[PDB]
Every structure is written in C-alpha cells, then in structure tokens.
C-alpha cells in the first residue's frame, strides 16, 4: 500500500538526450535512430524571437552551423527539415541506445513522465497532467527547451511531448513529437496566455478509489446521484463534465472495490460543497486531478516494464 | 520556475536491479560489480517469518538454492554471506552497467528517489523523505522487496535504503545498504509500530523560499522572531525545533530572496497560527516538508547530472 505520484523509469530516455547549439543558444535534442529532433527556436536569437519567419531563417543555415554533442562526442549533422515547430537534423551516426518507441499525441487529462534536461544532461523526473487548457505545470528553467514527456508501455517510449516555452502565469507549453503544438501557442514572444483551466473530474474520482483501496473511508456515504444531478454540481465547482466514457473506464476500480462509479460521485458532490473539514485524503488537502484511472490500477497492482 | 517533486534520473540504478528467487520467495536484489544485495528474508518462508534465526536458516542453504535471475540472462551464486539484515550473493559475472557509488546512511529529513520494482523489473520512480520516526511513507506491494532509494551526485549514485517491510499503519520501514535499519524495526512479523512522527521544519521553511522564488508571496511579513520563541510555536505543532545549523543551511536561499531566515519563521508562525484560509503554497493546501534546502537550490537553478 501506500500511492504516491509516480514516474516512470526514465532509463530509456536518458540514452536519447543530446545537446544542440546553433549560434548563441543551446537547448536539448532527442536523438533516435540517426535523427536529432529538438525547438526550431534553436535557430533564432533574442532579436529573432519576437516574429520569426522561421522558413526564412532556416534557408540560411548550413549543416555545420548545428554542434550536436552526445555527452563528450560530437555528432556531425548531414542534413536538415523542419515538420511543424520541431527541426530534424540527420546525423551521421545513429543512436545504438535508440529503445523501441513511438510518437502519440495524447488527450488532455492524461498524464505523463517528463525528463527535465539542460545542456543534454538530466536533471530530473517527474509526473504531469496535460491540463485541459492544454498546458502542464511543470518545473522548467532556461535552457530546458527539448526535454520530452513519455509514457512507457511494457518495453516500448511512447513519446507525447517536447518542451518550448513558459508563458507569463508560470505554466508551460509544447508540442507533441511531430512539432504540432498542445493548444493554441505559438512559438514567439508576444502576448498569449493559458486560458481558463478546470479540474479534470474522472482523474478525481479515481484518485477517490486509489484512497478507499488504501483505507481511507472517511469520504464515502450512501447517498447516490443521477449523472445528470452530478455535473449539475461540477460545473458550478469548476470541473469538467462526466461521460458515460469516463464511467466505463471507472468500472475496473468500481468493481474492485465495490463501491458504484454513481455512488463515488454522490460522494465528490459532498466534498465539493462542505470541503474536508481538517481531514486529508492520501496526504492531500486538495482534491487531486493528476491520476487516470490507469494510474491508479498500474500502481495499485504493481506492473513494471521491461 | 515551477516546482515539483522532483526523482533523479533512474537509469543508472535500473541497470542494477535483478529477480533474486530461494525457495517460494522472489524478491528484488541490487547488482554491482560481481555482488548481489538482498534483504535476508528471503531464505524465509511463510511460516519463517514469525521469528527467525536468520543464522539458522542460512546455514542451511546452498549456492545453488538462489535463483538470481538478471532479466533474460540466468546468474550462477558462488558464495553467500549475510551482513546484519542483507545478503551478498557472489556471483559469477561482474556488472558490466555498475555505476560509480557509494553506500550511505541518511539522517531523518533528507530525501531520496525510489525505484519500486517487482520481479526485478522497475516500475516507477518517486521521491520520499525519511521521516522523524525512521520510516517513509512509500508506495509499496508485495514484491517490492529489494528496491533501492539513492540520491545523485554529479556521475557517483549514493545507494541509501532497501526496501523490507510494511508497518501496520501502512508506511514501509528498511535498511541501508549494510543492511542495518533505518529505526527500531526488525526484520520479523511481531508486533511493531512507528512511533510518533513530527514535521521537518527545515524543509518546510526552505519549501516557503522555493515558493517566493516561484511568485508566491502572500503569507510574507514584516513580523520577525527569535529562535528561540519560534521553537516554542512550533513545538506546540508537533514540528521539530530549528537549530542555527539549519538556520546557517537555510542561508544561501535566505541570501538569494533577500528574506533573512528569522523572517521567514515569524511567516511559519502565522500559517500555523491561523492556517491558510483557502489560499495554496505551490499547489498544496498543507505546509510540505519533503524538500531539502538543497532539493530547493538544485531545483530552482537547474543541476544537471552526467
Ligand atoms: C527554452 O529552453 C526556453 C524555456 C523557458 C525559459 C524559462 N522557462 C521556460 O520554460 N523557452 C523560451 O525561452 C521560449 C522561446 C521564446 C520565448 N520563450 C518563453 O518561454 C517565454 O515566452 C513568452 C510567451 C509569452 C510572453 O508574453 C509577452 F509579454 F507577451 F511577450 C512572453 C514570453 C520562444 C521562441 C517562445
Ligand atoms: C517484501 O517484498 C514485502 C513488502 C511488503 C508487502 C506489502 N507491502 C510491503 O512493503 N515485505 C514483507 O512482506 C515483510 C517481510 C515479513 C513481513 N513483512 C511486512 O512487510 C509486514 O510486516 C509486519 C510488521 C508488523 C506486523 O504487525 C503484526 F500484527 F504485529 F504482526 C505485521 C507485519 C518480513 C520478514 C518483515
């Protein structure tokens, strides 16, 4: 027992971090098969970023003005492309660490491991949601542009997420691998922000079960509601509305534990309206969103990776 | 900026973890060099676990009693050895992925990653603090026997717990890598329990200057307080007494915000006088006290490791 926020093991994606510079900028690169992938902001300057072409500025770059150094060995780029806001350098060695992976662009609400890297050297890891604004509160400092975000799934990286900015109300926002951003940014320096967040109601509810299965029964009731009468509640409270989906999906927990999906819900409905009142659920006074329903499962039965 | 709890790379220790089976027992084990580590219980068996003589259930073994099986690849023992509550199988292949580390025992508050594996197989990384009271509030089923907790340090990974057992109150109790306990527990299902746990003062007032380097500064004031009168308030809290010594660690940070560490004290005062009244420090409704003054630094300008 116990549940804590959990990442996965960030081996395989160690062996991908690589350094990029080009002129006065350095960020991270990933580096599978002979490929180098990494913000095609690296190509600009301070003057640059604030309305870049980047067409125009990538026209005038050759290969050798791209140092990408894999720890202590440079790696010679022979080639260059840019696909939506990420650049691919073509080097000449591929990467003998390359694990199995893929590229998935994922759905807000689901969750993921992020490797923060600078100048190609982890520093650490950690779990996020991608929040239904389409931006994650992460822990980013300059020079963190081209850490990734994973999931692992027996032995293959499913790979979600490349870093590239920080916007002025300290969240963070990216793209997925093939360099389409997760919502409405854009990578320049102008006015943007995140807007209007909520709180992601299924990953509550099975954040409930992940308690009732580690023996805190405070919470519950006998009360029950229709799911209709609940997202009545939850849209007052900020929450996103409930599907028969997200119901489905809570079934394996429901069924574990005994306790009906509806009846869960009776239970939030009263937690959001008289608060907790001192008590704590798995050592959190808030009601915490950043756990799916497959989080819950994977930790609370123990499957690994290999 | 951004601030989150935040593991050490795991790759250096995945390389380390292999299935360690004698009898009807699998447990994890940790592979450096030509040396297998593992709790002793696993020459236990069910009804073993009651009181055993250790020694007794030793004697009787053989080499060729220890399935140490390291992913696809079998590993002949050729020597055992019991060190307090480890074993140390010698085997015939020396770890060509051994990192350069140390063995190191931790003093109560100072924190550390975990990675929780099962059959030899890493499931996920987390951080943890020792508590007060010598335990960790972990995640941990059953199987999870063997997982390590390790901090690093530039390439040098510092080992310091093994997973062992779990207490009736649901927190997990284990040893360093010499195998002696971290607190009064044995290595025996009898009754135990963990004693009293208190708040981490230190960390909890470095986790009040993380959060002012983050832009959170509302329970900031001018009130300042001695030493001495803030350790009356807060050992009427159940948190443990400050010392100059944690007064001089907390300098640095002190320094960078420009807020002496006395003030950021009379600040605790009030929190803990008058709560928080719906605000959130860095999203958490509870004053947290798993990050060290160093876990703070490290975090807030971007350490790397090699
Ligand atoms: C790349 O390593 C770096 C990481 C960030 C630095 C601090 N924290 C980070 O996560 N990215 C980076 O610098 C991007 C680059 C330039 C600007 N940028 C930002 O993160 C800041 O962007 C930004 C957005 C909006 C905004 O509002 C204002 F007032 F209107 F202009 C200011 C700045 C790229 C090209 C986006
Ligand atoms: C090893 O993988 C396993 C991990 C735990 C199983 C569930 N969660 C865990 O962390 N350890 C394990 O089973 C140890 C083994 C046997 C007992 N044990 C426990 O974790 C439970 O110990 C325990 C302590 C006190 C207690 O009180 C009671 F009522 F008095 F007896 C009950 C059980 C070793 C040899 C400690």
Chains 1, 2 share one sequence.
Not at 198 to 206: E, K, R
Not at 243 to 262: E, F, W, Y
Not at 279 to 298: C, H, M, N, W, Y
């Amino acid at each position: 027992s116990g549940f804590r926020k959990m990442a996965f093991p960030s081996g395989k994606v160690e062996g991908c971090m690589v350094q990029v510079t080009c002129g006065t900028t350095t960020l991270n690169g990933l580096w599978l098969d002979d490929v180098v992938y990494c913000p095609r902001h690296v190509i600009c300057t301070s003057e640059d970023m604030l309305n870049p072409n980047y067409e125009d500025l990538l026209i005038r770059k050759s290969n050798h003005n791209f140092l990408v150094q894999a720890g202590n060995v440079q790696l010679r780029v022979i080639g260059h492309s840019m696909q939506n806001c990420v650049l691919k350098l073509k080097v000449d060695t591929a990467n003998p660490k390359t694990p199995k992976y893929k590229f998935v662009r994922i759905q807000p609400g689901q969750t993921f491991s992020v490797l923060a890297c600078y100048n190609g050297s982890p520093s650490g890891v950690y779990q996020c949601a991608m929040r239904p604004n389409f931006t994650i509160k992460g822990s980013f400092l300059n020079g963190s542009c081209g850490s990734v975000g994973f999931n692992i799934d027996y032995d293959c990286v499913s790979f979600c997420y490349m870093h590239h900015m920080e916007l002025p109300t300290g969240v963070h926002a990216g793209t997925d691998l093939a360099g389409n951003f997760y919502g409405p940014f854009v990578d320049r320096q102008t006015a943007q922000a995140a807007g209007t967040d909520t709180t992601i109601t299924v990953n509550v509810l099975a954040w409930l079960y992940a308690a009732v299965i580690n023996g805190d029964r405070w919470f519950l009731n006998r009360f029950t509601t229709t799911l209709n009468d609940f997202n009545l509640v939850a849209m007052k409270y900020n929450y996103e509305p409930l599907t028969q989906d997200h119901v489905d999906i809570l079934g394996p927990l429901s069924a574990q534990t005994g306790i009906a999906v509806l009846d869960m819900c009776a239970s939030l409905k009263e937690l959001l309206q008289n608060g907790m009142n001192g008590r704590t659920i798995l050592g959190s006074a808030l009601l915490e969103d950043e756990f799916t329903p497959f989080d819950v499962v994977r930790q609370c039965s123990g499957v690994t990776f290999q």
